[PDB]
Paper text:
In our studies we have focused on the periplasmic segment of GspL (historically called XcpY) from P. aeruginosa, GspLperi, which consists of two domains: a membrane proximal domain (MPD) connected via a short linker to a ferredoxin-like domain (FLD). The inner-membrane bitopic protein GspL can be considered a central player in the T2SS because it appears to interact extensively with other components of the system. Even though the exact mode of secretion via T2SS has not been fully elucidated, the role of GspL is anticipated to help in linking adenosine triphosphate (ATP) hydrolysis to the assembly of the pseudopilus, which together constitute the two crucial steps in exoprotein transport. In this work we presented two distinct crystal structures of GspLfld, which in combination with the crystal structure of GspLfld from Vibrio parahaemolyticus, provide direct evidence for the conservation of a hydrophobic dimer interface.
Author numbering:
A (entry chain A), B (entry chain B): 304 to 381
The structure:
Amino acid sequence: QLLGLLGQAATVIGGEPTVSVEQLDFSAARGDVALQVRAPGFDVLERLRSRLSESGLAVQLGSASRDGSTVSARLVIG
Amino acid sequence: QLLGLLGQAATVIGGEPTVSVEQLDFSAARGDVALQVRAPGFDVLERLRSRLSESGLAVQLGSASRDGSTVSARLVIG
């Protein structure tokens, strides 16, 4: 079902213009979608996780850290 | 400017239910989306390429080979 999931996540992440997707990958073997994202701050990552989850997606937000103007984290979408 | 790219590709690929996405990776450094797909036959991969291109996506279909019941190839979008 990692086809509606992709499209839905992409639409939700597009509703957060300050979020950038640096890398993204899925494998059938692993079973989920992993995204490396950057955002101006942690509140934006939390909101994005909230929006993905609200849309019905299983989402995990990895540990975030700040470097300069942005924070970065790994998102896992079921 | 590729969240819609991925979202659009997911919709087009979803219109080909016999195609399976085994792996998918994107990288901003690379600048495109690579997909490892399988399908029952080459005609399905060619139809999928045609549909992605028809939808307005830049698409390249790598060399395909058969193993057992399926063929496999690499798709590059963007």
